[PDB]
Amino acid sequence: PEIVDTCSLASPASVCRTKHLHLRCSVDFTRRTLTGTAALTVQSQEDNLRSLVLDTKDLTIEKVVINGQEVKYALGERQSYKGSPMEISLPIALSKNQEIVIEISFETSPKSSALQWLTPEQTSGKEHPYLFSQCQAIHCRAILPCQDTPSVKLTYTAEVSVPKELVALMSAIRDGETPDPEDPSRKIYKFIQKVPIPCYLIALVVGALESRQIGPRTLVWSEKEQVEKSAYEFSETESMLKIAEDLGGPYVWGQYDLLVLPPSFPYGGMENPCLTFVTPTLLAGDKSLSNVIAHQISHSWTGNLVTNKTWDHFWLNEGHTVYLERHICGRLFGEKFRHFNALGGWGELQNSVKTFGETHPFTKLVVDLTDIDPDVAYSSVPYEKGFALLFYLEQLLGGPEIFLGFLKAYVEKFSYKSITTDDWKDFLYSYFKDKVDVLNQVDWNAWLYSPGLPPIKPNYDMTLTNACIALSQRWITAKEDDLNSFNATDLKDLSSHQLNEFLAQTLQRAPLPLGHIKRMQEVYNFNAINNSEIRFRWLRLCIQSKWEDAIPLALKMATEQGRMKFTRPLFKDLAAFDKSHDQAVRTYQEHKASMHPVTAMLVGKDLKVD
Ligand SMILES: [Yb+3]
Ligand SMILES: [Zn+2]
Numbered sequence: 001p002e003i004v005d006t007c008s009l010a011s012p013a014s015v016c017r018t019k020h021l022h023l024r025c026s027v028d029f030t031r032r033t034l035t036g037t038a039a040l041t042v043q044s045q046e047d048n049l050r051s052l053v054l055d056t057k058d059l060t061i062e063k064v065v066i067n068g069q070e071v072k073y074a075l076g077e078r079q080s081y082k083g084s085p086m087e088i089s090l091p092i093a094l095s096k097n098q099e100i101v102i103e104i105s106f107e108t109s110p111k112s113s114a115l116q117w118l119t120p121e122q123t124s125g126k127e128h129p130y131l132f133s134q135c136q137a138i139h140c141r142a143i144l145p146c147q148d149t150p151s152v153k154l155t156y157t158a159e160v161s162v163p164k165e166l167v168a169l170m171s172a173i174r175d176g177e178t179p180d181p182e183d184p185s186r187k188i189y190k191f192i193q194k195v196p197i198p199c200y201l202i203a204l205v206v207g208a209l210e211s212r213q214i215g216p217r218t219l220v221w222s223e224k225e226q227v228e229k230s231a232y233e234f235s236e237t238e239s240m241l242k243i244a245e246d247l248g249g250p251y252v253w254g255q256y257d258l259l260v261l262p263p264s265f266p267y268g269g270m271e272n273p274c275l276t277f278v279t280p281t282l283l284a285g286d287k288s289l290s291n292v293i294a295h296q297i298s299h300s301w302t303g304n305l306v307t308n309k310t311w312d313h314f315w316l317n318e319g320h321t322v323y324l325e326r327h328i329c330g331r332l333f334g335e336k337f338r339h340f341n342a343l344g345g346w347g348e349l350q351n352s353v354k355t356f357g358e359t360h361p362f363t364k365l366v367v368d369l370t371d372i373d374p375d376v377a378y379s380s381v382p383y384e385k386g387f388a389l390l391f392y393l394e395q396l397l398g399g400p401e402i403f404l405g406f407l408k409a410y411v412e413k414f415s416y417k418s419i420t421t422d423d424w425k426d427f428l429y430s431y432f433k434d435k436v437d438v439l440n441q442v443d444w445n446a447w448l449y450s451p452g453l454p455p456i457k458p459n460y461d462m463t464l465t466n467a468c469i470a471l472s473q474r475w476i477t478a479k480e481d482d483l484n485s486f487n488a489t490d491l492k493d494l495s496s497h498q499l500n501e502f503l504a505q506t507l508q509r510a511p512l513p514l515g516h517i518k519r520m521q522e523v524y525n526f527n528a529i530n531n532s533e534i535r536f537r538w539l540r541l542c543i544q545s546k547w548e549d550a551i552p553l554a555l556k557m558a559t560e561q562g563r564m565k566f567t568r569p570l571f572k573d574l575a576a577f578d579k580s581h582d583q584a585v586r587t588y589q590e591h592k593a594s595m596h597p598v599t600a601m602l603v604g605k606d607l608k609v610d
Contacts, residue, residue: 008149009085026161032110044094055141055148057083058109114139124223130207137374140199153196171203171272203272222260248301264562271299281532298324306414319386339461349384358452472505503537510544
């Protein structure tokens, strides 16, 4: 009764399980390689085990040692994005539950899809280079040989040699630093992760980093030039940790540090344990994008403690975490705000479903990733169809206090484990046994397995949304002789969040007439806003509405940062505008070599430029 991880080529957890990784490596900026040894402590789950298979991607293997002697191994043919399977022949057959240590000597490729190597010119300080990883979903195999499946959890320790002017950090507790005895131009940084984790949570950064304390268990890390602004921007972090602990139970990870990466970091935030990674596009100056912090914090329960068994079940990670995120922000800013953000998320789902099409398999809640790259299937669907299901169930079963009791019991039940949608569903029924007649009203096949918008829409408070819709509708319904009526005062009682939702509402009906968009800049001066979420939607509205003056502004945002949420749609919208098409493509081609490897692939696909 085992389950299949169709994104991994390694032996499954039913055959063998990695219990620990000891990584010893050196970061070579002249070669853009990580070189070292991965010592995997492996437990047999079978009688008479005589071989096993690991995932690899663009790794060079030097040798494999067990019991102090080299052993036979073979690398199979590459399977596209999944990489190449590595079969290791064990020297003595293992009994069930026997544990051995396998030490693999390897080197990464400069093209490693897990890594971006930055030159000094690409950093803030301009003197030193920089390295960062991103393993979720299936890029840990492009760093080191492993069972690259979230169905397996392991502890780890590491020693990382770097040029002595730089700092290494990992998703782990810091365990000291020392000069490298093999090379006095280097330092060795040590790390320990004593909580078992899925390997997609392994993370590394190397650069000219400094730290500032912002709470009792939190330092923010960045280059010098960003430290002061980051400490302010993220100053709600400890209050959010305290709320999260109330909702999910104790925080088990020791430290909660934050790392603010350079602008090409591909995501808004990644929940690497003990060291969340975030985009610098969160530095709005007013703490207004802190829901991304609340999301990563929440993963310290839903995701890092309770984990999806395979990426087909990614909605478990994300839906529950958006649910908790929105509760943290509702406790800080009020229940009307929670419903505002919830309703907005439904808008996002509407957008995503229209983009893929209402029958598309990537619009199912549980996806089948057989032969699909997870990076391509990735979308807002698991987040927002997931959230919508849990919000619907909250309403069905008695409200937020009652549903939060379920969430905490779910985290407790499945801590340190990896689970499927059916495990989740079974526990829901158990917990809610005295409401099973309500539960049986749910159309489970449609919500879990059908494409498109869900079969039923929750109920949402409208208080904070109403002014956004009203203003949007005034603009959409305006004719030329109404344009004079608009004025800066129209925005005076709108928060940044409400201005963003006004633009989202308006973008859903784009294009508008060019003269309307010019009027908007004349009276609202949106070109002056630096909030990245607001600028992104404004520039999309401008390019879809065929305003040539917006072309250079959209090109610049698309290239001067690399969060894919912003760069992919800006490039797509520029390619679709005939006036900007040729330049969009020439700009992608010019920048491709120095982009994040996954962002480069996905922008190329989006533009049909191979
Ligand atoms: Yb009129
Ligand atoms: Zn997440």
